Design a protein around this motif. Structure first.
Motif, PDB file in Angstrom:
ATOM      1  N   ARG A 173       0.071 -56.933 -20.371  1.00 13.35           N
ATOM      2  CA  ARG A 173       0.923 -55.960 -19.702  1.00 13.35           C
ATOM      3  C   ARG A 173       1.660 -55.119 -20.735  1.00 13.35           C
ATOM      4  NH1 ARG A 173       4.336 -59.790 -15.923  1.00 13.35           N
ATOM      5  NH2 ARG A 173       4.243 -60.894 -17.943  1.00 13.35           N
ATOM      6  N   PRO A 174       1.632 -53.793 -20.622  1.00 15.33           N
ATOM      7  CA  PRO A 174       2.481 -52.955 -21.475  1.00 15.33           C
ATOM      8  C   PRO A 174       3.913 -53.455 -21.456  1.00 15.33           C
ATOM      9  CG  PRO A 174       1.016 -51.581 -20.217  1.00 15.33           C
ATOM     10  CD  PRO A 174       0.824 -52.973 -19.702  1.00 15.33           C
ATOM     11  N   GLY A 175       4.480 -53.661 -22.644  1.00 21.10           N
ATOM     12  CA  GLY A 175       5.842 -54.145 -22.749  1.00 21.10           C
ATOM     13  C   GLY A 175       5.999 -55.644 -22.733  1.00 21.10           C
ATOM     14  N   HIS A 176       4.945 -56.388 -22.388  1.00 21.55           N
ATOM     15  CA  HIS A 176       4.943 -57.839 -22.485  1.00 21.55           C
ATOM     16  C   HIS A 176       3.936 -58.326 -23.517  1.00 21.55           C
ATOM     17  CE1 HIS A 176       7.053 -58.325 -18.463  1.00 21.55           C
ATOM     18  NE2 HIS A 176       6.548 -57.110 -18.344  1.00 21.55           N
ATOM     19  N   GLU A 177       3.620 -57.483 -24.503  1.00 22.35           N
ATOM     20  CA  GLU A 177       2.592 -57.803 -25.495  1.00 22.35           C
ATOM     21  C   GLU A 177       2.735 -59.227 -26.033  1.00 22.35           C
ATOM     22  OE1 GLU A 177       4.266 -54.908 -25.382  1.00 22.35           O
ATOM     23  OE2 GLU A 177       2.635 -53.454 -25.080  1.00 22.35           O
TER      24      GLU A 177
ATOM     25  N   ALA B  82       5.110 -55.103 -35.135  1.00 24.11           N
ATOM     26  CA  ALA B  82       4.009 -54.433 -34.455  1.00 24.11           C
ATOM     27  C   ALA B  82       4.502 -53.478 -33.373  1.00 24.11           C
ATOM     28  CB  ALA B  82       3.057 -55.474 -33.860  1.00 24.11           C
ATOM     29  N   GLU B  83       5.579 -53.835 -32.651  1.00 25.11           N
ATOM     30  CA  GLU B  83       6.164 -52.933 -31.660  1.00 25.11           C
ATOM     31  C   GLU B  83       6.659 -51.640 -32.323  1.00 25.11           C
ATOM     32  OE1 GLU B  83       9.659 -54.359 -29.656  1.00 25.11           O
ATOM     33  OE2 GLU B  83       9.524 -52.855 -28.080  1.00 25.11           O
ATOM     34  N   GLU B  84       7.369 -51.770 -33.433  1.00 25.48           N
ATOM     35  CA  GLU B  84       7.918 -50.596 -34.108  1.00 25.48           C
ATOM     36  C   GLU B  84       6.832 -49.718 -34.743  1.00 25.48           C
ATOM     37  OE1 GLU B  84      10.877 -49.428 -33.945  1.00 25.48           O
ATOM     38  OE2 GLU B  84      11.881 -51.113 -32.958  1.00 25.48           O
ATOM     39  N   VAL B  85       5.784 -50.328 -35.315  1.00 29.34           N
ATOM     40  CA  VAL B  85       4.676 -49.533 -35.869  1.00 29.34           C
ATOM     41  C   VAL B  85       3.979 -48.773 -34.745  1.00 29.34           C
ATOM     42  CG1 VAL B  85       2.429 -49.653 -37.042  1.00 29.34           C
ATOM     43  CG2 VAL B  85       4.340 -50.971 -37.887  1.00 29.34           C
ATOM     44  N   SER B  86       3.723 -49.453 -33.626  1.00 27.74           N
ATOM     45  CA  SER B  86       3.125 -48.809 -32.461  1.00 27.74           C
ATOM     46  C   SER B  86       3.984 -47.645 -31.973  1.00 27.74           C
ATOM     47  CB  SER B  86       2.923 -49.860 -31.360  1.00 27.74           C
ATOM     48  OG  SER B  86       2.467 -49.268 -30.171  1.00 27.74           O
ATOM     49  N   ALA B  87       5.298 -47.835 -31.927  1.00 29.31           N
ATOM     50  CA  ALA B  87       6.199 -46.758 -31.514  1.00 29.31           C
ATOM     51  C   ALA B  87       6.147 -45.590 -32.486  1.00 29.31           C
ATOM     52  CB  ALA B  87       7.627 -47.316 -31.362  1.00 29.31           C
ATOM     53  N   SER B  91       4.909 -41.701 -31.692  1.00 27.58           N
ATOM     54  CA  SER B  91       5.828 -40.611 -31.989  1.00 27.58           C
ATOM     55  C   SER B  91       5.199 -39.531 -32.862  1.00 27.58           C
ATOM     56  CB  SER B  91       7.077 -41.200 -32.650  1.00 27.58           C
ATOM     57  OG  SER B  91       6.930 -41.355 -34.047  1.00 27.58           O
ATOM     58  N   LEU B  92       4.047 -39.802 -33.511  1.00 29.82           N
ATOM     59  CA  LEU B  92       3.503 -38.788 -34.402  1.00 29.82           C
ATOM     60  C   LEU B  92       2.549 -37.891 -33.617  1.00 29.82           C
ATOM     61  CD1 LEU B  92       2.775 -41.145 -37.421  1.00 29.82           C
ATOM     62  CD2 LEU B  92       4.353 -39.230 -37.494  1.00 29.82           C
ATOM     63  N   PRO B  93       2.480 -36.604 -33.952  1.00 25.46           N
ATOM     64  CA  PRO B  93       1.425 -35.763 -33.380  1.00 25.46           C
ATOM     65  C   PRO B  93       0.062 -36.386 -33.643  1.00 25.46           C
ATOM     66  CG  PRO B  93       2.945 -34.461 -34.749  1.00 25.46           C
ATOM     67  CD  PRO B  93       3.232 -35.899 -35.020  1.00 25.46           C
ATOM     68  N   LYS B  94      -0.876 -36.119 -32.727  1.00 19.79           N
ATOM     69  CA  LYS B  94      -2.215 -36.709 -32.814  1.00 19.79           C
ATOM     70  C   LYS B  94      -2.821 -36.510 -34.195  1.00 19.79           C
ATOM     71  CE  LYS B  94      -6.698 -36.700 -30.273  1.00 19.79           C
ATOM     72  NZ  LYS B  94      -7.841 -35.757 -29.975  1.00 19.79           N
ATOM     73  N   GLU B  95      -2.692 -35.308 -34.752  1.00 21.73           N
ATOM     74  CA  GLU B  95      -3.335 -35.025 -36.024  1.00 21.73           C
ATOM     75  C   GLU B  95      -2.630 -35.686 -37.206  1.00 21.73           C
ATOM     76  OE1 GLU B  95      -0.213 -31.819 -35.420  1.00 21.73           O
ATOM     77  OE2 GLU B  95      -1.744 -32.727 -34.088  1.00 21.73           O
ATOM     78  N   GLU B  96      -1.466 -36.317 -36.996  1.00 23.80           N
ATOM     79  CA  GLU B  96      -0.789 -37.101 -38.025  1.00 23.80           C
ATOM     80  C   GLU B  96      -0.955 -38.597 -37.854  1.00 23.80           C
ATOM     81  OE1 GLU B  96       3.208 -35.779 -38.855  1.00 23.80           O
ATOM     82  OE2 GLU B  96       2.731 -33.812 -38.054  1.00 23.80           O
ATOM     83  N   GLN B 153      17.652 -47.968 -37.156  1.00 23.72           N
ATOM     84  CA  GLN B 153      17.584 -46.641 -37.746  1.00 23.72           C
ATOM     85  C   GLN B 153      16.248 -46.522 -38.475  1.00 23.72           C
ATOM     86  OE1 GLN B 153      20.666 -46.209 -40.592  1.00 23.72           O
ATOM     87  NE2 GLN B 153      20.157 -44.107 -41.198  1.00 23.72           N
ATOM     88  N   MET B 154      15.579 -45.376 -38.376  1.00 28.83           N
ATOM     89  CA  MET B 154      14.429 -45.040 -39.235  1.00 28.83           C
ATOM     90  C   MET B 154      14.876 -44.043 -40.290  1.00 28.83           C
ATOM     91  SD  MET B 154      10.911 -44.927 -39.660  1.00 28.83           S
ATOM     92  CE  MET B 154      10.075 -45.069 -38.093  1.00 28.83           C
ATOM     93  N   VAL B 155      14.583 -44.339 -41.559  1.00 27.71           N
ATOM     94  CA  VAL B 155      14.882 -43.432 -42.676  1.00 27.71           C
ATOM     95  C   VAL B 155      13.574 -43.081 -43.387  1.00 27.71           C
ATOM     96  CG1 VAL B 155      16.373 -43.123 -44.743  1.00 27.71           C
ATOM     97  CG2 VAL B 155      17.094 -44.600 -42.869  1.00 27.71           C
ATOM     98  N   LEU B 156      13.455 -41.840 -43.841  1.00 27.69           N
ATOM     99  CA  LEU B 156      12.241 -41.334 -44.493  1.00 27.69           C
ATOM    100  C   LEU B 156      12.535 -41.168 -45.986  1.00 27.69           C
ATOM    101  CD1 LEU B 156      11.668 -38.718 -41.662  1.00 27.69           C
ATOM    102  CD2 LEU B 156      10.516 -40.914 -41.962  1.00 27.69           C
ATOM    103  N   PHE B 157      11.666 -41.662 -46.866  1.00 29.23           N
ATOM    104  CA  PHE B 157      11.763 -41.441 -48.328  1.00 29.23           C
ATOM    105  C   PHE B 157      10.369 -41.093 -48.839  1.00 29.23           C
ATOM    106  CE2 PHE B 157      15.924 -43.339 -49.112  1.00 29.23           C
ATOM    107  CZ  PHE B 157      16.029 -44.341 -48.179  1.00 29.23           C
TER     108      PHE B 157
END
Ligand SMILES: Cn1cnnc1SCC(=O)c1ccccc1
Lengths: 300, 237
Positions: A173-177, B82-87, B91-96, B153-157
């Motif tokens: 389920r999305p969100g229950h990974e 893995a949740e944060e990498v997926s997010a 968040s990136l445009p398709k071509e990025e 927080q996400m920071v870019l360097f």
């Protein structure tokens, strides 16, 4: 009691009927199997003496018609057929019995093995996994691949088992990974049981059929399916108590019946060690854990 | 498949890829309790997500509040990563978006694969390289922003500063890994090498000092010495 007569036995062959087997010599006067218990599905299977390659056979239920076996010299195998003329069939069988040319299904009165291995297996569900709608019986052999194997090639000759895939959107389920991957109860109870199989009897029937095709034909995709269906239950924290109790009985009789010499190829170390020792259900399969530890302690 | 010495130049081709390192996500201090038992106290952490071709580092700071009331934190940390990498990808445009994500630890494979089921065309790969990205928190400016964070927080360097103006991404990655390996093997010595000469400064918008080409050769040689040394001081050779 029902009968599967044979027209003849032109090639030397080992014949199986359920968990029993006997050797027939080339052109030996063999005309079939009698005294087959009514009320159960059955499988009659074959391994030629000259090509132990390809075990093959037929699932059938004598309540659904009069079936016989006849060797085809063009296709080179023993074929099941239905006889629609009821009187021709009874006259054939009675003649072969009078001449005592048939082996007797050799069931011991005490013995519930076959019942215990086929408790939830129904012909109508077999015929949906093995699609050949013009026959009332179903052919299976060692080489047939499953739909899921084909996704990772002839679809008409495939085993259409229910696809189970733990890293699939169906399973997660999305969100229950994390929750759904580590505890598969959602996938077991909502997706598969409530959604696809409808009840646990159909789930167990497919699990039992997959095991039997693995054991009798060395069908590799069937073994994969059997282990996947075990693992999905064992990896669920929330399983109805009646299902766990029944699963323990199912697996007990499967492990009991497995040839000792085939355990190396038919049992997946990872699944069994996970199921008996790591999983949520590690403490719920008492009969199965006891026979596994006394019969295959090497695997563990 | 797995990323190793054989296919090393693939990092610097034109298929977008990201390394993900989770070794600093869940960080604790271990201490005694008044009763003489042992307990942990979490401190802020970070996901280290790096484009090796461009130097672009997406530093997702993991604030200790994310662990409150949670059990089995080391396991959760992999799934939170893995949740944060997926997010980040979404968040990136398709071509990025990356065509591959390489995880530095194999235990990240299943968590990331499950979180990225929506992206069947993004390959999730392990590596056999023993990359020194755990030493990211030895970089003063990165450690500072992680420890000061009071919320997620996400920071870019750019972890290469302006090096790509003068060197290739193969050479920049090699310098980065050498510096990080040194900082991992003997942080005090490594930092002495980098800052000894007060006339070489770190620009406000940079992470590392403003070395000339010649001074980088001196620096890189001093880091190699250090790593071989500690390798003697360690094994007695
Ligand atoms: C442009 N920008 C924005 N923030 N820092 C920078 S400097 C390095 C850079 O371009 C970059 C872009 C995206 C991610 C990481 C780094």
């Amino acid at each position: 009691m029902n009968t599967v007569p044979f027209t003849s036995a032109p090639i030397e062959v080992t014949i199986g009927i359920d968990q029993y087997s006997f050797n027939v010599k080339e052109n030996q006067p063999f005309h079939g199997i009698k005294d087959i218990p009514i009320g159960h599905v059955h499988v009659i299977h074959f391994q030629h003496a000259d090509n132990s390659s390809m075990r093959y056979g037929y699932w059938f239920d004598c309540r659904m018609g009069n079936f016989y076996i006849q060797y085809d010299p063009k296709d080179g195998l023993y074929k099941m057929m239905e006889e629609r003329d009821g009187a021709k069939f009874e006259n054939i069988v009675h003649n072969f019995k009078e001449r005592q040319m048939m082996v007797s299904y050799p069931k011991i009165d005490e013995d519930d093995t076959w019942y215990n291995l086929t408790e939830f297996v129904q012909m109508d569900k077999i015929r949906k996994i093995v699609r050949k709608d013009e026959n009332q019986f179903s052919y299976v052999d060692s080489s047939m691949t499953t739909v899921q194997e084909n996704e990772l090639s002839d679809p008409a000759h495939s085993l259409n088992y229910t696809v189970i895939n733990f890293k699939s959107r169906e399973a997660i389920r999305p969100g229950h990974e994390m929750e759904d991957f580590l505890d598969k109860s959602y996938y077991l109870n909502t997706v598969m049981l409530q959604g696809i199989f409808k009840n646990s009897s159909n789930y167990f029937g497919e699990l039992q059929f997959a095991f039997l095709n693995a054991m009798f034909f060395g069908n590799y995709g069937s073994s994969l399916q059997w282990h996947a269906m075990i693992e999905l239950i064992c990896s669920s924290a929330t399983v109805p108590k009646h299902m766990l109790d029944k699963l323990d009985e199912i697996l007990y009789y499967q492990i009991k019946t497995l040839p000792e010499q085939y355990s190396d190829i038919l049992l997946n170390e990872r699944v069994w060690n996970i199921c008996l020792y790591s999983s949520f259900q590690k403490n719920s399969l008492h009969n199965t854990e006891k026979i596994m530890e006394n019969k295959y302690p090497e695997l563990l | 498949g797995a990323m190793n010495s054989s296919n090393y130049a693939e990092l610097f081709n034109n298929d977008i890829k990201l390394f993900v390192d989770d070794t600093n996500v869940y960080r604790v201090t271990v201490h005694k309790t008044f009763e003489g038992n042992v307990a942990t106290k979490a401190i802020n952490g970070c996901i280290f997500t790096l484009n090796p071709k461009t130097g672009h580092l997406f530093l997702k700071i993991i604030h200790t509040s994310v662990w409150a009331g949670q059990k089995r934190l080391s396991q959760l940390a992999k799934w939170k990563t893995a949740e944060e990498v997926s997010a980040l990808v979404r968040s990136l445009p398709k071509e990025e978006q990356p065509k591959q994500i390489i995880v530095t630890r194999k235990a990240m494979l299943d968590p990331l694969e499950v979180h990225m089921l929506d992206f069947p065309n993004i390959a999730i790969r392990p590596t056999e390289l023993r990359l020194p990205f755990s030493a990211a928190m030895s970089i003063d400016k990165l450690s500072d922003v992680v420890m000061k964070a009071t919320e997620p927080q996400m920071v870019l360097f750019n972890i290469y500063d302006d090096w790509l103006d003068r060197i290739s991404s193969y050479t920049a990655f090699s310098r980065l890994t050498l510096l990080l390996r040194a900082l991992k093997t003997n942080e005090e010595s490594a930092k002495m090498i980098l800052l000894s000469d007060p006339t070489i400064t770190i620009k406000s918008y940079h992470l590392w000092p403003s070395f000339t080409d010649e001074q980088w050769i001196t620096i890189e040689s001093q880091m190699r010495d250090l790593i071989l040394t500690e390798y003697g001081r360690k094994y007695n050779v």
